[PDB]
Amino acid sequence: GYGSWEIDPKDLTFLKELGTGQFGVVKYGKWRGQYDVAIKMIKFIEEAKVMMNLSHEKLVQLYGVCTKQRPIFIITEYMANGCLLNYLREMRHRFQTQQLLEMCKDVCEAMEYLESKQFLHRDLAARNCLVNDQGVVKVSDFGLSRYVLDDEYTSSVGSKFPVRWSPPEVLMYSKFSSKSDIWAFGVLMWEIYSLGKMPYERFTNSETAEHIAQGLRLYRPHLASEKVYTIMYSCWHEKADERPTFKILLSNILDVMDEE
Ligand SMILES: */C(C)=C\C(=O)N[C@H]1CCCN(c2c(F)cc(C(N)=O)c3[nH]c(C)c(C)c23)C1
């Protein structure tokens, strides 16, 4: 069994529907009458192990599972503001650049933790992060949580590939490494500073792969200072070994926060 991880479904309440998709319905509810939760109802062992062994303040946390019945429930921490991509696109937030840098640091801390555990995420992107009521960004879409947010890469059986978040060696040779997560992180910083624009927005995926191969890089968003742009651009070195680590990126981000 899952021991302390197995939740009694009698302890869950269902308050509001958050979304309906390929892997089932997600509801907001309460657990044990006091904890706000997201409850996924699956329309497993391997993906469960991933979430039961990774824990960080900037990763969306698994609280437990209901597997003694069908359909299965996956219970996680509640992130009231939904995905980071839609949060960035909501122009009423009128974000200050200080807020945008804090979102970058939240994700960088999660990634530094993942890299310290030798875990490769493989689909880092603003659509795969969630935002809580306090505006804190947390990385999701790993293990069981891929099914929670009805991930299009997972639901399409790998057909919808994240071309726009991939380095040249992934596109050409399927060479995944810590350095392909570093590249995706720089694209995520670009999504944040662009207020959620699609990277390479006027190109198709095929054109993007061709231009990347030719050395095209995303332009500096107007909200990004030259120092912030240097950080995201460092993620896109043609040579994977010349890209920084997440520990280095975190130190760069803190230095900018201290300077600005
Ligand atoms: C962004 C580009 C997409 C997006 O928000 N997709 C939804 C799809 C339905 C389920 N969603 C979801 C979720 F999986 C988990 C949580 C949570 N841990 O609180 C969640 N909160 C909200 C407000 C939503 C919509 C959530 C993601």
Structure tokens at 246: 């997440």
Rounded CA gap, 246 and 134, in Å?
24
Of 137, 128, 134, nearest to 165 by C-alpha is 128
Cα radius of gyration rounded to whole Å, the chain: 19
CB atoms within 10 A of CB 208: 18
Residue ranges of domains in the chain, CATH in brackets:
1-78 (3.30.200.20), 79-260 (1.10.510.10)
Q: How far is the CA of 83 from the centre of ligand 1 (A)?
A: 6
Q: Which atom of ligand 1 is nearest to the CA of 26?
A: 10
Gap from CA of 101 to ligand 1 centroid (Å): 22
User: In this structure, are strands 24-31 and 12-21 parallel, antiparallel, or unpaired?
Assistant: antiparallel
Structure determination method: X-ray
Measured CA to CA, the distance from residue 246 to residue 250 in angstroms comes to 6
Mutate to test the pocket of ligand 1, among 26, 39, 42, 133 (most ligand atoms within 8 A of CB): 26
Active site residues: 123
> Atom 4 (ligand 1): residue with closest C-alpha?
83
Q: What share of the chain is helix, strand, coil (3-state, %, to 5)?
A: 45, 15, 40
Nearest residue to 253 via CA among 223, 233, 238, 231: 231
**Parallel/antiparallel/unpaired status of strands 12-21 and 35-42:** unpaired
- Sorted by sequence, the CB contacts under 8 Å of residue 215 that are 6+ apart come out as 238
Beta strands in the chain (DSSP E): 12-21, 24-31, 35-42, 62-66, 73-77, 129-131, 137-139
Six token digits for residue 226: 């030259």
What's the token pair of residue 208? 């993007």
| 104 contacts 54 by C-beta, under 8 angstroms | no
- Tell me how far apart the alpha carbons of residues 89 and 34 are, in angstroms, rounded to a whole number: 31
Task: Tell me, in Å, the resolution of the deposited structure.
Answer: 1.4
Would you give the distance in Å from CA 190 to the centre of its chain? 14
